[PDB]
Design a protein around this nucleic acid. Structure first.
Lengths: 117, 204, 122, 137, 52
RNA sequence: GGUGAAAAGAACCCCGGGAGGGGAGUGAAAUAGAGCCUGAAACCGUGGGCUUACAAGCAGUCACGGCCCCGCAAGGGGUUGU
RNA sequence: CAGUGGAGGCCCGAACCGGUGGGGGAUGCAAACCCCUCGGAUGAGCUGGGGCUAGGAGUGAAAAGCUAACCGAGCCCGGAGA
RNA sequence: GUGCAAGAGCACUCAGGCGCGCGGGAGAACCCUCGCCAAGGAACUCUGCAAGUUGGCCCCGUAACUUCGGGAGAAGGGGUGC
RNA sequence: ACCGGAGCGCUGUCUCGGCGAGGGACCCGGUGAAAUUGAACUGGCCGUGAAGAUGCGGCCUACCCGUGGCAGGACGAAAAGA
RNA sequence: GGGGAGGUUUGGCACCUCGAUGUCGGCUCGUCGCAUCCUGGGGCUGAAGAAGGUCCCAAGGGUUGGGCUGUUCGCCCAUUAAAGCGGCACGCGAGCUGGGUUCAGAACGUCGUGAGACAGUUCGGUCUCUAUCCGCCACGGGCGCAGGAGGCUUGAGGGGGGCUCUUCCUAGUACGAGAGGACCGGAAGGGACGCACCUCUGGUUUCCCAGCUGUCCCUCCAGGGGCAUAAGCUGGGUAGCCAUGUGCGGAAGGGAUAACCGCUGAAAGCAUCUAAGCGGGAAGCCCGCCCCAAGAUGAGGCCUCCCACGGCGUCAAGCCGGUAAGGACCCGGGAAGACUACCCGGUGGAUGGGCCGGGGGUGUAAGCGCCGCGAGGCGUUGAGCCGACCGGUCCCAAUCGUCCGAGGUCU
């Protein structure tokens, strides 16, 4: 019997690892994102790390966040806009509002991933 | 028939004189005698201990009359030690001198819908030379025509864990009145943060 | 943890230089053995004109092992090899000068000469 | 109740202090309490530390030597009332937490894989003999 | 086809019997403050929105 | 193989992207609406009456009772509890 | 003897040709498959194209194998409603 | 195209072309495929079936027997990177 | 890639199993088969009967309806016994 | 020489089954029988003691690992308290194997001119993904339990468990010429199996940390990412799940007994364990232990909370909207789990996510500076990285709300 631990996912190791990244990239571009409750709830955590990481400055943190996302120009958008707006706010750099419309032809539940303002 | 409730905080080990005593930790934070049972009007004897304080928010239930009847701060849980009548107050850990042996019940780790190999330490099959569709299979279950049924309770694949269990004759190793903790011998069912009753032992 | 088939050494000037286990004397059907436990075993090699010959079905006590014993004091101990000293049925060690580390356990099991003679009971 | 951990540290009073620091990869001996019949010893166990695994209480290092031709590995809880001394005997540059590998080349191959942290030694001879002057005069 | 197969056509009464809990429980909804419209509980839905 | 006496093969409106229906209209007949005369049985459904959750079965059948139903009345049917 | 020399139903190993062992597959992806391993791999090699040989007949490094997915005698029609 | 003694090998990758025409989640047993393992090391079992060890190159070195070709990659062992 | 005996190496073959990964299984949405099927309102035992009974007899236990699993029975399916 | 019993053996008869009832042996899973292999209890003895022989009681439990063999069997080896026997379609192929055997190839001895044949041998040879019903192991939904609720319980009735070795004291005492060597009671260890546990030991730990090759890539150096498996590879690993690892249990004791040992005592002036009465006596039976359990339709009990009609039905049970206790919905989640159920929690909130501290794991990041032609090395450094575990923090997320649910029959 499994799960006595704590975590979720569907996909293999290196897929899901990319998944979170191809979501981060979108999240950190469109600001609002609308996938499935699970992915969403997972995106949640992931980016929160980076954001909180970008709330720090030194070039090391940058390279460390630049390790997930890849566009060196996106990371600029992070340390040159986002995080600066998250000072005086410790943690909770995201929000996951669940929409009430499912996808047609797989009855998938949906939601939102918002950079909290 | 002494008896006190608690939880399973966690377990490590100590050193008695110079030998190592692997201990587990139980918690008998003062327990309120909530109701008793006189054969006079119950059919037997037993004292129901309550446990773990509680804001009168989830207590909104009619249990509040029940506590207010027994002048008892509104707890969260309560069960019956058999024939354990102390005195008009409440039971600490002062009940168990260090050294005394205790019987310890508790609910086991739920191991989901487990396999035969797991449930009943069955044998299943050979990882090897044939079949490769039975390696954790039960095997045969019955006989040919006669009987033609299967024995009620033939060890098969089901749920393993989440059942009431007791473990007995345990050496209470130390008792911490100062902060209500109970040292035992280590092997005690249930996970951490787990509810468990403890009572004097069956030795004589 | 030595079990029936396992290759032990010979912590002594007995004659054998390597024996396989044959049966664990312990219970009527114990799974294994450990330092201080006895086993019937077979000699799979021996120095020429040794007191013991090859093929000799011997009784040997374990001195060392590759699976750590647990000391009631929470400690442990494990050697780099499974070893044995061969013994006259009275459980008296057959070699003269034994050699090779051994386990404190033996001292509680009637086997003085093994550890008396032994260099370093550890 | 809010402190599932601090409850066992309430137990924690069976914990030592005087014992020196000794990260894994340096030769250290440890005088050990044993029973030779009905008396008590101080068995000098001197060897290289092969693995420390931590847990506040019940945390164990494991030493390793080569007693008379053959090699051994005793275990030692870091808080066992059965350890009189524990004079380390030479710091060592380790470069890895659990050094099991030394099993298959304990010899004149080891003497080139664990030189010595000429770094921690500095601290020692300094702190030691320098704390003396603050305890003497 | 292979090994296990039905030994008997399933009596309609037993088929319609196995259906017992087929029925689907209609979606749970509640009016919302924003509009007089219907929403599922804990869901952001059109003709409305929210607050931050 | 089959509408119909005749295409008179359903204008227009309505919902619907369509399919498809609802009114209006044609026709003696549209439950003759187009694979459409007749429309059987299996089989699938919706509403109603009776009936079932301590009960053991080739399912029917005697016997009585309750309920529901046509009938002045006596009676007849449907169901089925024992 | 050394050098050169570059023979071989020689050697390792792709393509290609096989199908040994095991696992899967068994209303299969498949009326013969999938994976791991394995055999030959300049020869009695493999293969495209154009051609000839067939029913008691052919072909056959021989199993009674093959001859249009069941060959101790093909398939279709026919005597035949044996 | 680059790297490995070489290569149509392998790994990654050009130009090019695809993600295999059901998706969503949950992370029970059980099956497949797969990775690891304490101590033992064929006790398994009809059988080391399977799996595992070994592997490339260069070097040292190589038994019986022999048709004097072979046995030979016998066996065992060292080196490899920067 | 014949069949047999043993020895070294090495191993989940085994003692003895454990944990982990992925594809199914499982839950939701779309799609939606199959052999089989006298009819079923299909329990246990000891009998009994064409001699191996849910269906006869006596006795016993059984509230109705299912979902995931096991494969003992329905002399289960399959093929008018090789 | 006689009489049986059983229905495990070899047969006999040919009754069901040839529009199919898959045969040997093993693995798995067993269950039952007693005619008992062991352990417990007895009678006798050609029983000193110890040991053993035989009969009796007794299934509760246990009944080993290998060598050979297709084997069942048996032989052997090392043990053991013992290494029991049989039933169950020679239990078990819709559970597995396929060595054996009964296919087509092939050969050997062999009979046969022969084609072929052989309870003679030898090599090889295709065991079918999908369970309707019963039975079974698990989990639910509906209804029930004559007010409706929340919580705690009684245990009818079931199940589980049940084993057993060695050693020291009593004592080297009774015993015996000695060797040998006890009853009895007492004490400490061990095997195997069971249950639970993760503290230690020890495994996994799938992207927790680092190391490495090749490659392509961002961005040229440093720094990094993809891929090499669905982890590229190697070293290492908390939580969790785990066994080799840790704790526990098999009892004690009460009662009724088996064989058996006995008190009193006739029938029958004695005697008799018996026909009246009574007592002692097994690991077995009944409690005891653990778990299941009021669908215990015979539906229990205990404490506490809510409490008339608000409208149609005159008479009758009913019927309708709102309500009380409270329950449910939904959402957030759990060492709960397939689903469902179960459990905590839901802004009065720490419920996950985040953030921080601690734990723990990796083992001195990046950058910069110093040294070396250089690969590197040294420091700043136990640094940087840092899932699960232990706590805190309302930053994000369980906001708002809907439905349901008493009106309490009769004697």
């Amino acid at each position: 019997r499994h799960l006595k631990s704590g975590r979720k996912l569907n996909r293999h190791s290196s897929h899901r690892l990319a998944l979170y990244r191809n979501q981060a990239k979108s999240l950190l571009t469109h600001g609002r994102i609308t996938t499935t409750v699970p992915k969403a709830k997972e995106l949640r955590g992931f980016v929160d790390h980076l954001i909180h990481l970008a709330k720090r400055g030194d070039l090391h943190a940058r390279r460390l966040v630049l390790r997930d996302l890849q566009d060196v120009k996106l990371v600029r958008k992070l340390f040159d806009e986002i995080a600066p707006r998250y000072r005086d706010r410790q943690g909770g750099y995201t929000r996951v509002l669940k929409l009430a419309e499912r996808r047609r032809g797989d009855g998938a539940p949906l939601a939102l991933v918002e950079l909290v303002e | 028939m002494k008896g006190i409730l608690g939880v399973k905080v966690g377990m490590t080990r100590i050193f008695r004189d110079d030998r190592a005593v692997p201990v587990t930790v139980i918690l008998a934070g003062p327990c309120p005698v909530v109701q008793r049972r006189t054969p006079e009007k119950d059919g037997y004897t037993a004292v129901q201990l309550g446990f773990l304080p509680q804001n009168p928010k989830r207590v909104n239930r009619p249990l509040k009359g029940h506590f207010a009847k027994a002048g008892v701060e509104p707890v969260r849980i309560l069960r019956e030690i058999r024939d354990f009548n102390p005195e008009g107050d409440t039971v600490t850990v002062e009940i168990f001198k260090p050294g005394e042996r205790v019987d310890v019940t508790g609910t086991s780790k739920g191991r989901g819908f487990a396999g035969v190999m797991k449930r009943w330490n069955f044998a299943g099959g050979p990882d090897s030379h044939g079949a490769h569709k039975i390696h954790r299979h039960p095997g045969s279950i019955g006989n040919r025509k006669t009987p033609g049924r299967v024995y009620k309770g033939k060890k098969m694949a089901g749920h393993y864990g989440a059942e009431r269990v007791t473990v007995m004759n345990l050496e209470v190793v130390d008792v911490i009145p100062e902060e209500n903790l109970l040292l035992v011998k280590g092997a005690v069912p249930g996970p951490n943060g787990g509810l468990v009753i403890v009572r004097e032992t069956k030795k004589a | 943890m030595i079990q029936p088939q396992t290759y032990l050494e010979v912590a002594d000037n007995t004659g054998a230089r390597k024996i396989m286990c044959i049966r664990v004397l312990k219970g009527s059907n114990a799974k294994y053995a450990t330092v201080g436990d006895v086993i019937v075993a077979s000699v799979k090699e021996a120095i020429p004109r040794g007191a013991v010959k090859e093929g000799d079905v011997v009784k040997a006590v374990v001195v060392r092992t590759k699976k750590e014993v647990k000391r009631p004091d929470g400690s442990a101990i494990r050697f780099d090899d499974n070893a044995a000293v061969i013994i006259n049925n009275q459980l008296e060690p057959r070699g003269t000068r034994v050699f090779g580390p051994v386990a404190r356990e033996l001292r509680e099991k009637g086997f003085m000469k093994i550890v008396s003679l032994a260099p370093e009971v550890l | 109740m809010n402190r599932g951990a601090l409850i066992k540290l309430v137990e924690s009073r069976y914990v030592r202090t005087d014992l020196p620091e000794f990260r894994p990869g340096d030769t250290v001996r440890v005088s050990y309490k044993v029973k030779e019949g009905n008396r008590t010893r101080i068995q000098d166990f001197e060897g290289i530390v092969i693995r420390i695994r931590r847990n506040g209480f019940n945390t164990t290092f494991t030493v390793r030597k080569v007693s008379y031709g053959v090699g051994v590995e005793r275990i030692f809880p870091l808080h066992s009332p059965l350890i009189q001394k524990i004079d380390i005997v030479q710091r060592g540059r380790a470069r890895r937490a659990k050094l099991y590998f030394i099993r298959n080349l304990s010899d004149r191959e080891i003497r080139r894989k664990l030189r010595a942290d000429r770094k921690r030694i500095d601290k020692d001879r300094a702190a030691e003999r320098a704390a003396k002057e603050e305890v003497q005069k | 086809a292979k090994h296990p197969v039905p030994k008997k056509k399933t009596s309609k009464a037993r088929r319609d019997a196995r259906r017992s809990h087929h029925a689907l429980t209609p979606p749970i909804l509640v009016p919302c403050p924003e509009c007089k419209a219907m929403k599922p509980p804990h869901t952001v839905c059109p003709e409305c929105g929210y607050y931050a």
